[PDB]
Amino acid sequence: GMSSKVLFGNNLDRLNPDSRNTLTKIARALLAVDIDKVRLEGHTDNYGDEGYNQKLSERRAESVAAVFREAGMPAANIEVRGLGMSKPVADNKTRAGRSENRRVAIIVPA
């Protein structure tokens, strides 16, 4: 369940109930131990153009941000960033790699 990486289907930007429940637990844990800040970075595969992917990455990051806000984390303490297709961690040549690029990274910055 719990992971810093949240995955999405091809061209999708929402969260199913299992994902939302997992993310609520992460959010509530961070709230409980009085963490200052969470940074949510949205990402895409490189299919489609820069702008298309930029906006998709923003929608993904916002979906995750909303779960943190609903759990009680103030918006002022959440940094939401879409990086589009620019910072892959896996191989866009393959389905498996593209799948691992379709993500939000949950970060607790120092």
Numbering used by the authors: 61 to 170
Article excerpt on this structure:
Crystal structures of the periplasmic domain of YfiB were determined for two different constructs: from residues 27–168 to 1.58 Å resolution, and from residues 59–168 to 1.39 Å resolution. The YfiB(59–168) construct also excludes the region from residues 35–55 linked to increased membrane attachment. The longer YfiB construct crystallizes with two molecules in an asymmetric unit while the shorter construct crystallizes with only one molecule per asymmetric unit. Analytical ultracentrifugation data confirms that YfiB(27–168) predominantly forms a dimer in solution, while YfiB(59–168) is exclusively a monomer. The YfiB(59–168) structure lacks helix α1’ and strand β1’ and has a considerably shorter β1 strand than its larger counterpart, but otherwise retains the same core domain. The two structures can be superimposed with an r.m.s.d. of 1.3 Å for 105 aligned residues. The largest structural differences occur at the N-terminus, which dissociates from the β-sheet in YfiB(59–168), and in the β2-α2 loop, which packs against helix α3 in the shorter structure but is directed away from α3 in the longer structure. Strand β1’ and helix α1’ includes residues that are proposed to form a linker region that unfolds to facilitate membrane attachment and YfiR sequestration. This is consistent with our observations from structures of YfiB alone and in complex with YfiR that reveal structural rearrangements in this N-terminal linker region, including shortening of strand β1 in YfiB(59–168) and complete unfolding of β1 upon YfiR binding. The structure of P. aeruginosa YfiB(59–168) was determined by molecular replacement with Phaser using the YfiB(27–168) structure as a search model.
